[PDB]
Structure 1
Amino acid sequence: PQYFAIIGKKDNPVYEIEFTNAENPQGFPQDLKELNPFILHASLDIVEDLQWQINPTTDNCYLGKVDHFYGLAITAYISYSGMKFVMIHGNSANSSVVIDDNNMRSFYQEVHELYVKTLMNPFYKITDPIRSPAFDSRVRTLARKHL
């Protein structure tokens, strides 16, 4: 299963989704209720620590697998305003983001384009969630076609 979230400035969430394969339809079995937001909020901090490092632990936008915990790796992207696109990947065996590392860099850039496109509405303040029906189709067609 895959968990994806856009974490704001004060760490308040603005987009919150999971998407998973049809083999296990009820995804993340007894982690989605009780560990899956805690590992996200706990491992915001190493992403925050990596925002002021010139070289990691000459792009500084994509970040690799930044944490690995029970065999779940997370990947991160620090945008220009500071909204961080952290996403947890889950599998059966040891999951590899290295098979998609060339791929899903153009998933983070193609959701950052959607965040910039929903920033320019002047009625949209900061620190309020994205209550957009267009945004769901615009992220899940990108998740279906490019994983």
Structure 2
Amino acid sequence: PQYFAIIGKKDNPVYEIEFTNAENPQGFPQDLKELNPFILHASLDIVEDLQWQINPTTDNCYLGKVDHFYGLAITAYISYSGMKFVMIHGNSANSSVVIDDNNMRSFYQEVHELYVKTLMNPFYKITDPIRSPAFDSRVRTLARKHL
């Protein structure tokens, strides 16, 4: 299963989704209720620590697998305003983001384009969630076609 979230400035969330394969339809079995937001909020901090490092632990936008915990790796992207696109990947065996590392860099850039496109509405303040029906189709067609 895959968990994806857009974490704001004060760490308040603005987009919150999971998407998973049809083999296990009820995804993340007894982690989605009780560990899956805690590992996200706990491992915001190493992403925050990596925002002021010139070289990691000459792009500084994509970040690799930044944490690995029970065999679940997370990947991160620090945008220009500071909204961080952290996403947890889950599998059966040891999951590899290295098979998609060339791929899903153009998933983070193609959701950052959607965040910039929903920033320019002047009625949209900061620190309020994205209550957009267009945004869901615009992220899940990108998740279906490019994983």
Deviations 1:91-143 (A, max 9, x none): 00000000000000000000000000000000000000000000000000000
Structure 2: give runs of 5+ residues left out of the alignment: none
Partner of 1:123: 123
In structure 1, distance between residues paired with 2:139 and 2:118: 13
For the residue of structure 2 that corresponds to 1:93, the secondary structure is coil
Report the Cα distance in structure 2 between the residues aligned to 1:121 and 1:74, rounded to whole angstroms. 30
Q: Per-residue CA shift, 1:58-77, capped at 9, x if unaligned? A: 00000000000000000000
The equivalences for 1:59-138 within 5 A come to 59-138=59-138
User: 1:35 deviation in Å?
Assistant: 0.0
Q: TM-score, normalised by structure 1?
A: 1.00
- Residue segments in structure 1 that go unaligned for 5+ positions in a row: none
Instruction: Spell out, residue by residue over 1:45-90, the C-alpha distance to the aligned partner (whole angstroms, 9 max, x if none).
Output: 0000000000000000000000000000000000000000000000
Q: Tell me how large the CA RMSD over aligned residues is.
A: 0.0
Amino-acid identity (%): 100
> 1: distance between equivalents of 2:145 and 2:130?
22
Q: Distance in 2 between matches of 1:89 and 1:48?
A: 19
Matched, 1:19 2:22: no
Secondary structure at 1:81 match in 2: coil
Instruction: Give distance in 1, aligned partners of 2:121 and 2:31.
Output: 36
Query: C-alpha distance in 2, partners of 1:60/1:74?
Result: 17
Cross-structure match for 1:46: 46
- CA distance in structure 2 between the aligned counterparts of 1:27 and 1:84, rounded to whole angstroms: 24
TM-score, L = length of structure 2: 1.00
Partner of 1:144: 144
Kindly tell me the number of residue pairs found equivalent between the two proteins. Answer: 147
